[PDB]
């Protein structure tokens, strides 16, 4: 039962310095290679490095060989990354990899994986998101499905996360990719689908979070009276 | 500068026998380049599926295979199943450090789905910010190709619209796409006709879905 979770992401300010963790269960770490890789938005994966069980042999990307540094706690299950002279191009999501490493028969595998951590280099400030209602454009008579969401915009940075019901509803749930809008700040949104007969009677709220900024709203979305 | 390359998109039917190919810039890939697969599926979760270019990893079905074709490596699917749909991921060993491929979307056939349309209107709250969004829903549809153009009072609109679609669906591998014209609520007001039309395979003919500003 590996499990892999990372945290330190978030905004951090162009030529500065971040450092990042990540917790480890279900395994025996001190017996494991581990690894960093990260995915930039647009791009596909790019490997930071890795580190043996007696930390004795630490691997880089040839680029960053000095701008980042990983270390290890043994006793503690815990992976480091320190990132360092941060630049625009270093914004992408962390993630903290497992390397099952078997020189025997020449196996290596990146087996486990965690969700990743977000890191944004930016010289902008935080924003929380505005939260306005998808209203149903169907009345509980109309009879059948309904579509009813929540538009969440002008936020800074990425991510924010989207739940229904404090995540009682969870089917018919499509919470879209964010975009950035030319305002340099991101946008999305995330619909649902629901009986038109329980529209009335059925509470629809979503829950919407955005830790850069601490912003926590939920707004409950009604059909628009007339 | 090594550089590691992969076709972008693949499409098979299901049962049907997929290769997906990775190949080396600075020549032939070989057996000391650990050819290494990786499997995205939604919500940025990975799997290791291949090791040592051609061994399985525990948990990996038999279906999937890997090898050296030609001055390649590869990831051989066999009986392709909806539940492949994913990205995979090639990475080759370069003596001292590792070097991930672009990815490759696999994408499994089924019928064609037209999608459900819905036309949302700005809400009162977000005019008093001076911004108005219209916001166009395309419900579970397939294949992806889908055109979404916007009409202001019979006008056609451009470069003040954003979309966004969302991975292909595990279960009945559809697709949703969200279309948004960004206007201010100066030249919202200025119009009574706002209209979604869609195009797509699946539609004998384009899908309308309007409202009258006001209206209601
Ligand atoms: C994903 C992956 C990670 C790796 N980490 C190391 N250090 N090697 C190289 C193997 C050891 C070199 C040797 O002993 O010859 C890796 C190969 C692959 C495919």
């Given at each position: 039962e590996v499990?892999?979770?990372?945290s330190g992401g978030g905004l951090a300010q162009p030529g500065g310095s971040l450092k990042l963790s990540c917790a480890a269960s279900g395994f025996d770490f001190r017996r494991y290679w581990?690894?960093?890789?990260?995915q930039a938005p647009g791009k596909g994966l790019e490997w930071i490095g890795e580190i043996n069980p007696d930390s004795r042999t630490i691997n880089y990307m040839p680029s960053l060989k000095d701008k980042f540094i990983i270390s290890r706690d043994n006793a503690k299950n815990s992976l480091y990354l320190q990132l360092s002279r941060l630049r625009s191009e270093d914004s992408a999501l962390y993630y903290c990899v497992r390397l099952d490493f078997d020189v025997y028969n020449h196996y290596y595998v990146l087996d486990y994986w965690?969700?990743?951590?977000?890191?944004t280099v930016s010289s902008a400030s935080t924003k929380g998101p505005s939260v306005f209602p998808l209203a149903p454009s169907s009345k509980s008579t109309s009879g059948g499905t309904a579509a009813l969401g929540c538009l969440?915009?002008?936020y800074f940075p990425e991510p924010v996360t989207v739940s229904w019901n404090s995540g009682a509803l969870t089917s018919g749930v499509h919470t879209f990719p964010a975009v950035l809008q030319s305002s340099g700040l991101?946008?999305?949104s995330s619909v649902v689908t629901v009986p038109s007969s329980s529209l009335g009677t059925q509470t629809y709220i979503c829950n919407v979070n955005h830790k850069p900024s601490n912003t926590k709203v939920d707004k409950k979305v009604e059909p628009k009276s007339c | 500068e090594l550089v590691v390359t992969q076709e972008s998109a693949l499409t098979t039917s299901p049962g049907e026998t997929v290769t997906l190919t990775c190949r080396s810039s600075s020549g032939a890939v070989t057996t000391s380049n650990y050819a290494t697969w990786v499997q995205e599926k939604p919500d940025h979760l990975f799997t290791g599926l291949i090791g040592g270019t051609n061994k399985r990893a525990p948990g990996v079905p038999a279906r999937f295979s890997g090898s050296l074709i030609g001055d390649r490596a590869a990831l051989t699917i066999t009986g392709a199943q909806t539940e492949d749909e994913a990205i995979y991921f090639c990475a080759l060993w370069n003596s001292n450090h590792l070097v991930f491929g672009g990815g490759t979307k696999l994408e499994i056939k089924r019928t064609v789905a037209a999608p459900s349309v819905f036309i949302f209107p700005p809400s009162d709250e977000q005019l008093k910010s001076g911004t108005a969004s219209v916001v166009c829903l395309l419900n579970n549809f397939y294949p992806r190709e889908a055109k979404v153009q916007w009409k202001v009072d019979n006008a056609l609109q451009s470069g003040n619209s954003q979309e966004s679609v969302t991975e292909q669906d595990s279960k009945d591998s559809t697709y949703s796409?969200?279309?948004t014209l960004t206007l201010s609520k100066a030249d919202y007001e200025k119009h009574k006709?706002?209209?979604?039309?869609?195009?797509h395979q699946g539609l004998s003919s384009p899908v309308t879905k309007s409202f009258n500003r006001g209206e209601c």
């Amino acid at each position: 039962e590996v499990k892999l979770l990372e945290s330190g992401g978030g905004l951090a300010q162009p030529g500065g310095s971040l450092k990042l963790s990540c917790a480890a269960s279900g395994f025996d770490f001190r017996r494991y290679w581990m690894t960093w890789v990260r995915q930039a938005p647009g791009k596909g994966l790019e490997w930071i490095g890795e580190i043996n069980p007696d930390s004795r042999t630490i691997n880089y990307m040839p680029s960053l060989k000095d701008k980042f540094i990983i270390s290890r706690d043994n006793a503690k299950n815990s992976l480091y990354l320190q990132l360092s002279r941060l630049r625009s191009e270093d914004s992408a999501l962390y993630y903290c990899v497992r390397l099952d490493f078997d020189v025997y028969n020449h196996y290596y595998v990146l087996d486990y994986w965690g969700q990743g951590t977000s890191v944004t280099v930016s010289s902008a400030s935080t924003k929380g998101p505005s939260v306005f209602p998808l209203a149903p454009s169907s009345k509980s008579t109309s009879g059948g499905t309904a579509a009813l969401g929540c538009l969440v915009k002008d936020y800074f940075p990425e991510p924010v996360t989207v739940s229904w019901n404090s995540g009682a509803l969870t089917s018919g749930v499509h919470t879209f990719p964010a975009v950035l809008q030319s305002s340099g700040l991101y946008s999305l949104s995330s619909v649902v689908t629901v009986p038109s007969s329980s529209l009335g009677t059925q509470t629809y709220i979503c829950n919407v979070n955005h830790k850069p900024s601490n912003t926590k709203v939920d707004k409950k979305v009604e059909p628009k009276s007339c | 500068e090594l550089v590691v390359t992969q076709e972008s998109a693949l499409t098979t039917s299901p049962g049907e026998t997929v290769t997906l190919t990775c190949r080396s810039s600075s020549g032939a890939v070989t057996t000391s380049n650990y050819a290494t697969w990786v499997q995205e599926k939604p919500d940025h979760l990975f799997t290791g599926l291949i090791g040592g270019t051609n061994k399985r990893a525990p948990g990996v079905p038999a279906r999937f295979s890997g090898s050296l074709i030609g001055d390649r490596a590869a990831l051989t699917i066999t009986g392709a199943q909806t539940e492949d749909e994913a990205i995979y991921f090639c990475a080759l060993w370069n003596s001292n450090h590792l070097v991930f491929g672009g990815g490759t979307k696999l994408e499994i056939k089924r019928t064609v789905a037209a999608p459900s349309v819905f036309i949302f209107p700005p809400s009162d709250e977000q005019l008093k910010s001076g911004t108005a969004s219209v916001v166009c829903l395309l419900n579970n549809f397939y294949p992806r190709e889908a055109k979404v153009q916007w009409k202001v009072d019979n006008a056609l609109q451009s470069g003040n619209s954003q979309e966004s679609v969302t991975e292909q669906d595990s279960k009945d591998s559809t697709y949703s796409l969200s279309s948004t014209l960004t206007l201010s609520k100066a030249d919202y007001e200025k119009h009574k006709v706002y209209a979604c039309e869609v195009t797509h395979q699946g539609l004998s003919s384009p899908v309308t879905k309007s409202f009258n500003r006001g209206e209601c």
